[PDB]
Each structure stands twice: as C-alpha cells, then as structure tokens.
Amino acid sequence: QTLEHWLNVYHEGGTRLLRQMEKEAIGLWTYPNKKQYLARLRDFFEVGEN
DNA sequence: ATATATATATATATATATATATATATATATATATATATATATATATATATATATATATAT
Structure with a gap:
C-alpha cells in the first residue's frame, strides 16, 4: 500500500x-x-497521547 | 461463558431559507332580463235611430 496507489x-x-x-x-x-487515527497510533506505539 | 452497555459511524428525519405556481378574495365593467312608461291602433261594448222581416189580427 503506497501513497501513489491511494x-x-x-x-x-x-x-x-x-x-x-x-x-x-x-x-x-x-x-x-x-x-x-491518533488512538490507533497510541495503541500501536504504546505511548500516552502527550 | 452470554449478552450487555458503550462509542463510532452511518443513514434518515426534521427544520430553515428561497423560488415558483396556484387559489382566494375584492372590485370594476359588461350583458341580459324585467319592468315601466309612451304612443298608437284595434277591438269590444253600449246608446240611438232607421229599415227590414216576421208574427199576429181583421176583412175578404
């Protein structure tokens, strides 16, 4: 999946x-x-929102 | 081991604003019918006088 594809x-x-x-x-x-999306980033990288 | 109570996203329902067409209400002008009135002539009825036909009486 790539940006050009999108x-x-x-x-x-x-x-x-x-x-x-x-x-x-x-x-x-x-x-x-x-x-x-930001919640997904949080649960992916295991870090608080701050 | 089971669904239950919640958030997320989707879809629909509801409200606002504006454009457009149609309906309702009001007022004016026109045409139709009725009524009266005018004017004239005709038609009808009644009064008086005259002339004819009919009915009745006397003589023949």
Whole structure:
C-alpha cells in the first residue's frame, strides 16, 4: 500500500472506493476523523497521547 | 461463558431559507332580463235611430 496507489484509487473514485478497498485489503486501516487515527497510533506505539 | 452497555459511524428525519405556481378574495365593467312608461291602433261594448222581416189580427 503506497501513497501513489491511494492517489490513483482516489482518482478512480471518492471516499466510498477507499472504504471498499479497506475491506478488500489486509493490513490497512482508515479513519474519517483524526481522533480514532491518533488512538490507533497510541495503541500501536504504546505511548500516552502527550 | 452470554449478552450487555458503550462509542463510532452511518443513514434518515426534521427544520430553515428561497423560488415558483396556484387559489382566494375584492372590485370594476359588461350583458341580459324585467319592468315601466309612451304612443298608437284595434277591438269590444253600449246608446240611438232607421229599415227590414216576421208574427199576429181583421176583412175578404
């Protein structure tokens, strides 16, 4: 999964396409707002938000 | 070992603002019908006088 891949996918279609790709592809995650993504970063790197 | 109570995200329901078409209400102008009035002539009825036909009486 790469940034160019994401840009090409987006050029094909909007958010819904990326959400479908999320189901299709393994080892990938997306979040429509920054809070859940930051929670994912926290639980991945095992560090308090500060 | 089982669902339960919670957060997240999605989808739908509800409200606001504006554009557009239609309905309701009011007022004016026009046409139709009715009513009266005017004006004229006709038609009807009644009064008086005249002339005709009919009915009744006397003589023939």
